[PDB]
Write a protein that holds these residues in place. Sequence first.
Motif, mmCIF file in Angstrom:
data_model
loop_
_atom_site.group_PDB
_atom_site.id
_atom_site.type_symbol
_atom_site.label_atom_id
_atom_site.label_comp_id
_atom_site.label_asym_id
_atom_site.label_seq_id
_atom_site.Cartn_x
_atom_site.Cartn_y
_atom_site.Cartn_z
ATOM 1 N N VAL A 180 0.861 -1.158 0.031
ATOM 2 C CA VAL A 180 0.059 0.102 -0.023
ATOM 3 C C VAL A 180 0.825 1.266 0.096
ATOM 4 N N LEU A 181 0.844 2.025 -1.176
ATOM 5 C CA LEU A 181 1.387 3.206 -0.938
ATOM 6 C C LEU A 181 0.836 4.587 -0.679
ATOM 7 N N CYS A 182 1.429 5.286 -0.118
ATOM 8 C CA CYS A 182 0.877 6.900 0.488
ATOM 9 C C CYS A 182 1.554 7.468 -0.538
ATOM 10 N N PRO A 183 0.898 8.131 -1.551
ATOM 11 C CA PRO A 183 1.963 8.939 -2.623
ATOM 12 C C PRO A 183 1.964 10.427 -2.119
ATOM 13 N N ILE A 184 2.866 10.750 -1.698
ATOM 14 C CA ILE A 184 2.866 12.107 -0.988
ATOM 15 C C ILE A 184 4.155 12.915 -1.826
ATOM 16 N N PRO A 185 3.740 13.661 -2.427
ATOM 17 C CA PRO A 185 4.662 14.471 -3.166
ATOM 18 C C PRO A 185 5.128 15.658 -1.980
ATOM 19 N N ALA A 220 5.651 4.982 2.462
ATOM 20 C CA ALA A 220 5.383 6.415 2.378
ATOM 21 C C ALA A 220 6.050 7.171 1.444
ATOM 22 N N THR A 221 5.863 8.235 0.776
ATOM 23 C CA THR A 221 7.037 9.009 0.116
ATOM 24 C C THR A 221 7.082 10.252 0.782
ATOM 25 N N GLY A 222 7.916 11.208 0.466
ATOM 26 C CA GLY A 222 8.081 12.698 0.786
ATOM 27 C C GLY A 222 9.034 13.306 0.112
ATOM 28 N N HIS A 223 8.984 14.755 0.070
ATOM 29 C CA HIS A 223 10.116 15.433 -0.632
ATOM 30 C C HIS A 223 9.989 16.673 0.414
ATOM 31 N N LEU A 224 10.960 16.635 1.172
ATOM 32 C CA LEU A 224 11.309 17.706 1.936
ATOM 33 C C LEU A 224 12.771 17.497 2.637
ATOM 34 N N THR A 225 13.017 18.418 3.490
ATOM 35 C CA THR A 225 14.437 18.371 4.346
ATOM 36 C C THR A 225 13.839 17.847 5.690
ATOM 37 N N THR A 226 14.789 16.857 6.119
ATOM 38 C CA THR A 226 14.481 16.433 7.603
ATOM 39 C C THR A 226 15.620 17.121 8.492
ATOM 40 N N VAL A 227 15.154 17.078 9.679
ATOM 41 C CA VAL A 227 16.174 17.579 10.798
ATOM 42 C C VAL A 227 17.524 16.680 10.737
ATOM 43 N N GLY A 228 18.676 16.978 10.571
ATOM 44 C CA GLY A 228 19.756 16.534 10.663
ATOM 45 C C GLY A 228 20.209 16.011 9.238
ATOM 46 N N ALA A 229 19.546 16.224 8.347
ATOM 47 C CA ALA A 229 19.821 15.930 6.895
ATOM 48 C C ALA A 229 21.285 16.793 6.581
ATOM 49 N N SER A 230 22.030 16.218 5.884
ATOM 50 C CA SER A 230 23.236 16.676 5.230
ATOM 51 C C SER A 230 22.881 17.192 3.939
ATOM 52 N N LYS A 231 23.301 18.506 3.464
ATOM 53 C CA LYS A 231 22.728 19.006 2.381
ATOM 54 C C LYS A 231 23.999 19.406 1.273
ATOM 55 N N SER A 232 23.712 19.800 0.065
ATOM 56 C CA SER A 232 24.465 20.084 -0.831
ATOM 57 C C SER A 232 24.125 21.377 -1.572
ATOM 58 N N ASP A 233 24.980 22.092 -2.366
ATOM 59 C CA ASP A 233 24.916 23.429 -2.901
ATOM 60 C C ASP A 233 23.503 23.323 -3.709
ATOM 61 N N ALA A 234 23.349 22.189 -4.484
ATOM 62 C CA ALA A 234 22.121 22.312 -5.348
ATOM 63 C C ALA A 234 20.668 22.056 -4.575
ATOM 64 N N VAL A 235 20.748 21.970 -3.101
ATOM 65 C CA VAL A 235 19.578 21.590 -2.555
ATOM 66 C C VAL A 235 19.133 22.913 -2.142
#
Length: 332
Positions: free
Chosen positions: A128-133, A178-193
Amino acid sequence: IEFMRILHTSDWHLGQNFYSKSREAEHQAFLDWLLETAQTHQVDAIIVAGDVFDTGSPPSYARTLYNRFVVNLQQTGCHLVVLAGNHDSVATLNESRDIMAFLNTTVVASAGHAPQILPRRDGTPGAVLCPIPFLRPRDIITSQEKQQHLLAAITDYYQQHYADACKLRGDQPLPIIATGHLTTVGASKSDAVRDIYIGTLDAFPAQNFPPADYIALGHIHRAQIIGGMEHVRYCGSPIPLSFDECGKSKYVHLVTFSNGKLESVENLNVPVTQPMAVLKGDLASITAQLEQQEPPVWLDIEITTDEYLHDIQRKIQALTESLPVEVLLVRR
Ligand SMILES: [Mn+2]
Ligand SMILES: [Mn+2]
């Protein structure tokens, strides 16, 4: 005895203008490899967790890449789920939503899509997929601490959709994804983010995600496990989208479920087809570094300053000439 296999990818940024260079060749090679990979591993679904296109108005060659991929994936029977990221236009992805449905492809661009059964290749229920953009605040916020409001709105959204997913599943031994598209606490990011929810949500605490068997995220370009939970992951972008990611491995995740639960997450290395390099030092350091490949390497020349930023340009533009390579970025 019952398996379900999905491929988790994200952050394609098809059509990206990279210092006047096109990524078409790289994306073509990647999508070809992704097709082969889906067959090698008998994958039931590919999930693209947002940022399909670099902008809301992708060039024709990028639209073509995307369409041709969906067509070619039909030779496999593998299902395709395409989610919008913050770079995508909802209207642009929705242009082809109903058309794509004839090609075993579910395009989910806006918030509010109900959970859905992902079939195995043989048609039977697999997950079962929760399609969350990417969730646009306007689409989820109620009635206008704005920071606290958005976090609560996203958290509640996941709770409502997880609840619906559990109901849809009923008694069936199916994993919930489930899916998602966001920034989580603690995430390591890049310049293009690019920053999202600017002023409204610094980052999303992953402890607030519902207890899906897998959470497939996009937005962050470096593959990583989130909050120490192996079932909550960014797959990272499939090709390097900025010079600060070159030299670093690129992945898509092969995610296998067995008897309704997560069995394994494997990191599949995406072949790198366009050589890139960052140089750091002085004129002589760079000259030494510039020593001696059919696709010519793309260069970013970075350092401490020598003299006028404009003068360094002509200096390096002279040091580079007749060489078997190109030069895209030159900062200080
Ligand atoms: Mn992205
Ligand atoms: Mn993004």
